[PDB]
């Protein structure tokens, strides 16, 4: 991907493709979930659970949740 400022998302203070806001449940600290739609699920989620030093279990929900951003569903949708 080498595209322009289209919709870029904006977590606390740099820009991404797409992020992903993460409550744990507790209302704060409030997280996001910066993804680059040319990086992996498992990657991307395991970035930023290293990064914030959150735990592994939490790898599936928002690795599995950036995937949904590219695939149908939350995406593609696919609605008859």
């Known amino acids: 991907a080498n595209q322009q400022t289209s919709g870029k998302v904006?977590?606390?203070?740099?820009?991404?493709?797409?992020?992903?806001?993460?409550?744990v449940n507790e209302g704060g600290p409030s997280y996001k979930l910066p993804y680059n739609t040319s990086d992996d699920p498992w990657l991307t989620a395991y970035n930023f659970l290293q990064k914030n030093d959150l735990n592994?279990?939490?790898?599936?929900?928002?690795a599995k949740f950036i995937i949904d951003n590219t695939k149908g569903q939350m995406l593609?949708?696919?609605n008859p």
Do not use: A, W
């Open 10 to 23: 904006l977590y606390e203070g740099k820009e991404f493709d797409y992020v992903f806001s993460i409550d």
């Open 56 to 62: 592994p279990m939490f790898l599936d929900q928002v």
């Open 76 to 78: 593609g949708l696919g």
